């Protein structure tokens, strides 16, 4: 299907669906979101009126089942659920009067923003990162730490591939100076060939990390997104089309960020290195341009 119904909206909440956002008044007859473009992952996210620091939400793919949202009194949270296929369900969810109480997913923008933010993101990879369980959708919130964050402090965590520059996995014995300065071995042998297998899987996790940082204020995800960028930029040897694609991917991401700088969304230190010092800095034409236009404060 392409509708995500809500049982009701008993409490005031700001609802995000992908990059769009609307407010639902307490007990306003609201019964969900209709006309969702099938065949991209999607994310629905929530922020309550009384809670500013806490965002929470669900990544899902409408091709994998029928999902709906139900408010849980115990928890005071909106929860995603799966509903088994059925004629009766279809008939209530597609009823004209019911659909009049739903908000329509906005007609696609000519920049094709969502597709460009999620081109490489795949629901099955998302489930491997977030939690392998009985649900086909994945819960994320502002507080979830990453496996990496969990180790820096020496199952409810974000299992991103750990990208550790100071680690011995980054340095070949006998190449201590070379691999410290040039991350090509780490990027190509360890990460691309060993772990991700290809650049699409690498970009998928980079895109997912970015979206979590942005929609949930998840710092661990911001950390991951920056690390994945810096790993490419600080490698003297990068597969040909990978560099060109990265500039385009980053451009859309920077474009979608809020106008107000936030140090949990953009890392000034890393961005200054990538844009102005890194080996691949010249490959980031479009990204550099929008970064300077949008956030001159951070850059000089």
From Swiss-Prot:
Positions of modified residues (Phosphoserine): 235
Locations listed in the record: Cytoplasm; Nucleus
Superkingdom assignment: Eukaryota
Maturation and modification: Phosphorylated on serine and tyrosine residues.
Region (Leucine-zipper), start-end ranges: 243-264
Residues with PTM Phosphothreonine: 256
Additional remark text: Present with 7330 molecules/cell in log phase SD medium.
Gene3D superfamilies registered for this protein in UniProt: 2.60.34.20, Aar2, C-terminal domain-like (1.25.40.550)
Protein name in UniProt: A1 cistron-splicing factor AAR2
Keywords: Cytoplasm, mRNA processing, mRNA splicing, Nucleus, Phosphoprotein
CC terms in the record's Gene Ontology section: cytoplasm; U5 snRNP
Subunit: Heterodimer. Interacts with PRP8 (via RNase H homology domain and MPN domain), competing with BRR2 for the same binding site. Component of a U5 snRNP complex that contains at least the U5 snRNA, PRP8, SNU114, AAR2, SMB1, SMD1, SMD2, SMD3, SME1, SMX2 and SMX3, but is not a component of the U4/U6-U5 tri-snRNP complex.
Function: Component of the U5 snRNP complex that is required for spliceosome assembly and for pre-mRNA splicing. Involved in splicing pre-mRNA of the A1 cistron and other genes that are important for cell growth.
Keyword flag ATP-binding: no
GO BP terms, alphabetized: spliceosomal snRNP assembly; spliceosomal tri-snRNP complex assembly
Main location: cytoplasm
Residues annotated as signal peptide: none
Residues annotated as transmembrane: none
Membership in a protein family: Belongs to the AAR2 family.
